[PDB]
Scaffold this active site. Structure first.
Site, mmCIF file in Angstrom:
data_model
loop_
_atom_site.group_PDB
_atom_site.id
_atom_site.type_symbol
_atom_site.label_atom_id
_atom_site.label_comp_id
_atom_site.label_asym_id
_atom_site.label_seq_id
_atom_site.Cartn_x
_atom_site.Cartn_y
_atom_site.Cartn_z
ATOM 1 N N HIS A 41 0.806 -1.215 0.000
ATOM 2 C CA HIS A 41 0.000 0.000 0.000
ATOM 3 C C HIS A 41 0.841 1.268 0.000
ATOM 4 C CE1 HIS A 41 0.187 1.197 4.287
ATOM 5 N NE2 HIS A 41 -0.280 0.024 4.659
ATOM 6 N N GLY A 143 2.807 5.887 10.277
ATOM 7 C CA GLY A 143 4.191 5.667 9.849
ATOM 8 C C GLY A 143 4.824 4.358 10.344
ATOM 9 N N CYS A 145 3.649 1.355 9.615
ATOM 10 C CA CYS A 145 3.459 0.268 8.665
ATOM 11 C C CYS A 145 4.791 -0.271 8.180
ATOM 12 C CB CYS A 145 2.619 0.663 7.459
ATOM 13 S SG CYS A 145 1.009 1.321 7.932
HETATM 14 C C1 LIG Z 1 1.352 2.957 7.805
HETATM 15 N N1 LIG Z 1 2.491 3.322 8.190
HETATM 16 C C2 LIG Z 1 0.245 3.957 7.812
HETATM 17 C C3 LIG Z 1 -0.954 3.562 7.328
HETATM 18 C C4 LIG Z 1 -1.973 4.520 7.306
HETATM 19 O O1 LIG Z 1 -3.298 4.211 6.878
HETATM 20 C C5 LIG Z 1 -3.576 3.276 5.873
HETATM 21 C C6 LIG Z 1 -3.083 3.429 4.586
HETATM 22 C C7 LIG Z 1 -3.434 2.507 3.603
HETATM 23 C C8 LIG Z 1 -4.252 1.462 3.885
HETATM 24 I I1 LIG Z 1 -4.772 0.142 2.309
HETATM 25 C C9 LIG Z 1 -4.760 1.292 5.154
HETATM 26 C C10 LIG Z 1 -4.420 2.202 6.149
HETATM 27 N N2 LIG Z 1 -1.724 5.744 7.757
HETATM 28 C C11 LIG Z 1 -0.521 6.086 8.206
HETATM 29 N N3 LIG Z 1 0.470 5.213 8.209
#
Ligand SMILES: *C(=N)c1cc(Oc2ccc(I)cc2)ncn1
Ligand SMILES: *C(=N)c1cc(Oc2ccc(I)cc2)ncn1
Ligand code: NA
EC number: 3.4.19.12
Lengths: 301, 304
Positions: A41, A143, A145
């Protein structure tokens, strides 16, 4: 003695964490040998969040659209592919700090350590379990993820989780390192909700065995139970069924403490009925379900 | 979202752990620059341990009595000396993995990460607080002595604890890295007991602020209190007094959540008086006192 929620030492993983940027989005990636693994993503824009077509977004990218920073250094991306919901960026340098490792997909009730990271840099380490509803109860900000979960069961790091998203209840969803989600979740910002969660019965029993090993007997009783009557009662408190596999797995703890598994089940039944009446067990006023039978043996003996 | 007992990443410390053997005793040492730090009790046998004269046991030892292994390498011990209750073994090689570090003594109430080790091999990491009675509630087996505790303040590791022994209640005693015990303990096998412990008030308040930030709000109420009235209540429930400095430290959390410290004290008052009435806060049915104000801010802000 003592009994603590204990994480694995995180150094072997720390040396694999990198930052991945695509467009305006930065998250974390895991650099092993000459491949960086991260959530697919990362390639989404604001517009793509509900119904991303990842194959279509990815075909439009070249290698140089992916910026990978490992500490102070830019790595050169020389290849890209997607496997399920993870992106694999081939890079021009093998990580010299690559540990001995494997990828394992875990079952609900299994525990692991999470190294939470931001901008490719480790923030903290803690212990989690895969809930029966295939979420984890983590601690993750924007952040985070691409942060990963792992066990180290000798000198070999077993990677079992990569973080993808937060569900509305505040719990967390992610994949194995082959990019398959745990549970029925998808990497889209459509309404998704976790199933109702249950207590991990086998782990609670393990932890009661840990209390005994550390010299605590107050919650035992003179009774026993059949497995079926135990499950009929435990279900009414939103406890997972205990299976014959679970019974077998507890065998060593049973044999160490002199307390049969079905006897410990009787003790649990009573605790559910009575609560703790102002007492604690290993420092908790609740029944703890995030220690596995294996974890208990490792930390106690 | 979410809130967890979180340890500092341990990699920088893992690279400093070695094994120290003297006679039949093996335990852990900390290798920084060209010195290995470990508990001086390594030099004792069973009979010494009842009433050790450390200076006298130590003068009998040569450098070659201390076997130091860093992974699969023997380090050459070229000197030995004692500072308080820690042994310092000079070795012929500086640790190439020595991080930027300092030795600090912490105060009761402060938290740190412990890297538990066996045979110089890190086995686990967890977060601890120095209790008001100067023990820690750790998780340690035989062979864990010389395991250390630390904070990371930027890229600088601050070493604050080295494990020495278990007390009969199953809690733990140790020193700073200059070999001074936390608490009224000595390194000998005699009957020693921890004082009665109290709850770390300022940390409980910090944790209640963490609960609020994560959306757990049921214990807030319309009331406020004074420091003096609160302290009369804290004293009654075996809580540490709350000082004006504690109030200052919680200032950020107060301003962020809109709940003044003495307003949150009124919440805590009521919880002590009435209990939790079947409810939990951040998944706990007891008031947690092992998160500092800094810990809460760090975890609810993503410092790295
Ligand atoms: C990850 N570090 C992160 C994720 C999100 O939200 C998110 C983005 C894409 C999907 I598909 C699901 C959720 N926001 C900030 N950081
Ligand atoms: C440390 N690894 C360790 C200590 C002990 O017991 C012990 C030794 C000396 C003293 I003074 C107190 C307690 N046993 C195993 N391992
Ligand atoms: Na109030």
């Amino acid at each position: 003695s003592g009994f603590r929620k204990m994480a694995f030492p995180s150094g072997k993983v720390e040396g694999c964490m990198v930052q991945v940027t695509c467009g305006t989005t930065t998250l974390n990636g895991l650099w092993l040998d000459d491949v960086v693994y991260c959530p697919r993503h990362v390639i989404c824009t604001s517009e793509d969040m509900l119904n991303p077509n990842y194959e279509d977004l990815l075909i439009r990218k070249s290698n140089h659209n992916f910026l990978v920073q490992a500490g102070n250094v830019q790595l050169r991306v020389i290849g890209h592919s997607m496997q399920n919901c993870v992106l694999k960026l081939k890079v021009d340098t093998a990580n010299p700090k690559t540990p001995k490792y494997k990828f394992v997909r875990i079952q609900p009730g299994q525990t692991f350590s999470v190294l939470a990271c931001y901008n490719g840099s480790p923030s903290g380490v803690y212990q989690c379990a895969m809930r029966p509803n295939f979420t984890i109860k983590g601690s993750f900000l924007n952040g985070s993820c691409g942060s990963v979960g792992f066990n180290i069961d000798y000198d070999c790091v077993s990677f079992c989780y990569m973080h993808h998203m937060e569900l509305p209840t505040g719990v967390h969803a992610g994949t194995d390192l082959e990019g398959n989600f745990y549970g029925p979740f998808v990497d889209r910002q459509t309404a998704q909700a976790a199933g109702t969660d249950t207590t991990i019965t086998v782990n609670v029993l393990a932890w009661l065995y840990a209390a005994v090993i550390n010299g605590d007997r107050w919650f035992l009783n003179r009774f026993t139970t059949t497995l079926n009557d135990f499950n009929l009662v435990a279900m009414k408190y939103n406890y997972e069924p205990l299976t014959q596999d679970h019974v077998d797995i507890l065998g060593p703890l049973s044999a160490q403490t002199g307390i049969a598994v079905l006897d410990m089940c009787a003790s649990l039944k009573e605790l559910l009925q009575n609560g703790m009446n102002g007492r604690t067990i290993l420092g908790s006023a609740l029944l703890e379900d995030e220690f596995t039978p294996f974890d208990v043996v490792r930390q106690c003996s």
